[PDB]
């Protein structure tokens, strides 16, 4: 019901927001929409797509049939069979809401989940409902439900059962990549890549590898990046399947900068086909372009930007304008030059670095005991 469901939410994005992209999503969504009995959400989706077609009343009586066919099941059940809790009334009425998650909208499904949550006593059935809330909050990217039940999954449930939490570890950092947290929390608990089968709880494997390799080279530059992703072998199997992703890795690590841009050009354009995509693309590339500059200015202290004209790409004035924007950004600690045409660097010493940190933290605690001394003594 919900288990192959997330590809639909990809094609909801891909058809809609790139308005030029209206060719191939509708070709394999509408035939999937007449399948799977998908009836409630697609009305607005049919408005943004091609206007109308009469299959609506066809499956309306068919969604009313399987609504009524199992409604008459569990009302006769609760009127004849007298067990409660996790009884036959339970799994019939969760089959109603899982009929709603596959077919209907979220609202009937979530109130039936809250209807059936307080009827449970076992934590395993509770957590499987919280699996459903987290997935339907990931369908419609609603940031209110997902913040709540993850705390319910941590505190109220998973002091009990075990290794149905790694299924939600992949969901904790599914939240972090759809957020702007593309930096450390995503790449830290993506790093346990030992979860293989493309299940509901492991929504895909090969694209999960591409997700954890894109986010990985921002968490760390060389505090042993190469052991966890390059000397890592189980990661090295499936990036041996994908040649372009592996080339994107080894160009950066083995310092091939000219082919690194051609790899990074494909990545940003391939990133465009994603539904957790909005935080990435304007922020991801500019963070990596300044990432490649910083290690390249390392090992030199008298660089010439004419050497950037062929070892690096081309465009003498292009390197000139992009360094100028990044030095003025407060990053990229070097000093660009005109007619000498020598990119001199300036990096602080130990003492010139330590003196700056102590004067920042010094004035912070000084201001902190300014205000505290005024709260006391009237």
């Amino acid at each position: 019901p919900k288990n192959p469901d997330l590809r639909i939410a990809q094609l909801r994005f891909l058809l809609s927001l790139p308005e030029h992209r209206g060719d191939a999503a509708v070709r394999d969504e509408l035939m999937a929409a007449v399948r799977d009995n998908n009836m409630a959400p697609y009305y607005e989706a049919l408005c943004k797509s091609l206007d109308w077609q009469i299959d609506v009343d066809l499956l309306n009586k068919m969604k009313k049939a399987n609504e009524d066919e199992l409604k008459r099941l569990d009302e006769e059940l609760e009127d004849a069979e007298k067990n409660l809790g996790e009884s036959e009334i339970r799994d019939a009425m969760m089959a109603k809401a899982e009929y709603l998650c596959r077919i209907g909208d979220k609202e009937g499904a979530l109130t039936a989940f809250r209807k059936t949550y307080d009827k449970t006593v076992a934590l395993g059935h509770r957590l499987d409902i919280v699996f459903y809330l987290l997935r339907i909050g990931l369908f419609y990217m609603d940031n209110d439900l997902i913040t709540r039940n993850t705390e319910k999954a941590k505190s109220l449930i998973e002091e009990g059962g075990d290794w149905d939490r790694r299924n939600r570890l992949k969901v904790y950092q599914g939240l972090y990549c759809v957020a702007i947290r593309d930096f450390k929390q995503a790449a830290e608990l993506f790093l346990d890549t030992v979860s293989t089968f493309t299940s509901y709880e492991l929504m895909d494997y090969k694209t999960f590898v591409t997700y954890t390799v894109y986010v990985s080279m921002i968490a760390l530059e060389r505090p042993d990046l190469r052991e966890k992703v390059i000397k890592g072998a189980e990661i090295l199997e499936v990036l041996h399947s994908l040649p372009a992703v592996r080339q994107y890795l080894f160009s950066l690590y083995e310092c091939r900068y000219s082919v690194f841009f051609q790899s990074l050009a494909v990545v940003e354009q391939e990133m465009k086909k994603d539904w957790l995509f909005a935080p990435h693309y304007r922020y991801y590339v500019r963070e990596m372009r300044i990432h490649a500059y910083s290690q390249l200015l390392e090992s030199y202290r008298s660089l010439t930007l004419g050497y950037m004209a062929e070892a690096f790409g081309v465009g003498v004035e292009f390197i000139d304008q992009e360094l100028s924007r990044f030095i003025a950004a407060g990053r990229l600690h070097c000093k660009i030059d005109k007619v000498n045409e020598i990119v001199e660097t300036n990096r602080p010493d130990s003492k010139n670095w330590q003196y700056q940190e102590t004067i920042k933290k010094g004035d912070l605690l000084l201001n902190r005991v300014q205000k505290l001394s005024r709260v006391i003594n009237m």
Binding site: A233, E234, L236, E237, H240
Partner: protein, 52 residues
Amino acid sequence: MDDKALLVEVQLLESKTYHALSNLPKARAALTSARTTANAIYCPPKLQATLD
């Protein structure tokens, strides 16, 4: 099933291909499972050097 002698080779052939995919700890794992199986056969007469 019941046979034992054919299993030593196909465990050993997977240790080639897990190393061919450059998965070093898994290929060490599959080789050791081939070692403990290999010690109960009439002849590994040529399969010994293949394993070696």
